[PDB]
Structure 1
Amino acid sequence: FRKPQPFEYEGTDTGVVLLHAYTGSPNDMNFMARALQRSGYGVYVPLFSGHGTVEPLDILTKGNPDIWWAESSAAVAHMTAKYAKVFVFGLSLGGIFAMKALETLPGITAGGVFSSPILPGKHHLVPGFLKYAEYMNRLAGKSDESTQILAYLPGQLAAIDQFATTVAADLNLVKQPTFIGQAGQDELVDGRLAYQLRDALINAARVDFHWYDDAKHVITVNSAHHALEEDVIAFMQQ
């Protein structure tokens, strides 16, 4: 098993922070990061605590939204030290921190989300996490950990939602141009909430909203990624 590491591409004038998904890793952003590099952007993809190991329990016992927020904030600061302009985007979980960054951190030009409605709703992250863990255990030749996982999973999902509702309540603080991309066949989160995210951004200079009709949740990796990359790059060029 290869532990995905954080990675960085050097640019000149503009840098981009890409924040990965829950149970995800910097691998979530490989295609996006390279697309940005081909267009001359600097890119930084951090690793969230507890992620990127062969042991799914690490996510539940070594990471939490407060740590991940600190890591997101540190990632933004790393890039704003170097580049004239910095953009911050996030996939699902990462999108929560991307929006909180726009709301509360200095020096960010613009940013937004990939399949991250922010407003909590009906989701399928419990089955999603369990399927992820089952796949990881099958890779590592390890026995099932579902009972151990279920002692933590409801609580951590609740913690993420709790963090998210605060971010949602502060959406009025966002003044930067904001990008919203949402999968149209999203099996993990309620895509309808992306419309509520859009409508809550009452003070954003602009809201660039894109719906990826036939795509499943992870639009940075699946069939939608070429379209998403083009739309994100067009947004940045504006």
Structure 2
Amino acid sequence: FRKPQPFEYEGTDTGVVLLHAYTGSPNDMNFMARALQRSGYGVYVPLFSGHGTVEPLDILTKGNPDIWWAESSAAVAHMTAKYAKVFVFGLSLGGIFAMKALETLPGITAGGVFSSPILPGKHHLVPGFLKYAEYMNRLAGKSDESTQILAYLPGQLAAIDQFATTVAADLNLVKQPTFIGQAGQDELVDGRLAYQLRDALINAARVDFHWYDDAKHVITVNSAHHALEEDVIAFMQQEN
């Protein structure tokens, strides 16, 4: 097994922070980070605490929304110290922190979300996590940990939602141009909520909204990724 590590690409004028998904890793952002690199952007992809190991309990017991927020904030600061302009985007979980960054952190030009409606709703993250864990056990040749997982999973998902509702209540604070990309066949989160995110951004300079018709949740990696990369780069170039 290869532990995915955080990674960084050097740029000149503009840098981008990319924040990964729950149960994800910097691997979530390989295609995106490279697309940005080809267009001359600096890129930074941190690893959230408890992620990127062969042991799914690490996510539940070594990470939490508060730690991941601190890590997101540090990542932004790392990039704003170096580049004239900084954009911040996040996939699903990462999107929550991306939006909080726009709301509360200084020195950010623009940013937004990939399949991250922010507003909590019906989701399939419980089956998602369990399927992920099962696959991780399969690679590790380790016995099933579902019972141990279920002691923590509902609590951690509640904690994520709790963090998210504060971000949602603060959406009025966003002044920056905001990008919203959403999977149209999203099996993990309620895509409909992305419209409510759009409508809540009442003070954003602009809202650039994209719907990826046939795409599953992970639009940074699946069939939608070329389109998403184009749309994100177009967004950034518009706000240069």
* TM exceeding 0.5: yes
Secondary structure of 2:54's aligned partner:
coil
Deviation at 1:139, TM superposition (A): 0.2
Secondary structure of 1:90's aligned partner:
strand
Q: Distance in 1 between matches of 2:59 and 2:221?
A: 21
Deviation at 1:75, TM superposition (A): 0.1
Aligned to 1:68: 68
The count of aligned residue pairs is 238
Deviation at 1:78, TM superposition (A): 0.0
Aligned to 1:36: 36
Deviation at 1:81, TM superposition (A): 0.1
Q: Deviations over 1:54-106 (max 9, x none)?
A: 00000000000000000000000000000000000000000000000000000
Deviation at 1:202, TM superposition (A): 0.1
Deviation at 1:208, TM superposition (A): 0.1
Q: Deviations over 1:190-218 (max 9, x none)?
A: 00000000000000000000000000000
Q: Deviations over 1:34-57 (max 9, x none)?
A: 000000000000000000000000
Q: TM-score, normalised by structure 2?
A: 0.99
Structure 2 residues without counterparts, runs of 5 or longer: none
Q: Distance in 1 between matches of 2:193 and 2:203?
A: 18
Secondary structure of 1:194's aligned partner:
helix
Secondary structure of 1:128's aligned partner:
helix
Q: Distance in 1 between matches of 2:204 and 2:2?
A: 40
Q: Distance in 1 between matches of 2:24 and 2:8?
A: 17
Structure 1 residues without counterparts, runs of 5 or longer: none
Q: Deviations over 1:167-205 (max 9, x none)?
A: 000000000000000000000000000000000000000
Q: Deviations over 1:91-141 (max 9, x none)?
A: 000000000000000000000000000000000000000000000000000
Structure 1 runs of 4+ with >6 Å offset: none
Identity fraction in percent: 100
Q: Distance in 2 between matches of 1:137 and 1:26?
A: 20
Secondary structure of 2:152's aligned partner:
helix
Q: Distance in 1 between matches of 2:70 and 2:124?
A: 26
Q: Distance in 2 between matches of 1:143 and 1:181?
A: 37
Deviation at 1:158, TM superposition (A): 0.1
Is 2:144 aligned against 1:144?
yes
Deviation at 1:146, TM superposition (A): 0.1
Secondary structure of 1:18's aligned partner:
strand
Q: Distance in 2 between matches of 1:23 and 1:191?
A: 19
Q: Deviations over 1:4-63 (max 9, x none)?
A: 000000000000000000000000000000000000000000000000000000000000
Q: TM-score, normalised by structure 1?
A: 1.00
Q: Distance in 2 between matches of 1:215 and 1:39?
A: 24
Is 2:220 aligned against 1:220?
yes
Secondary structure of 1:123's aligned partner:
coil
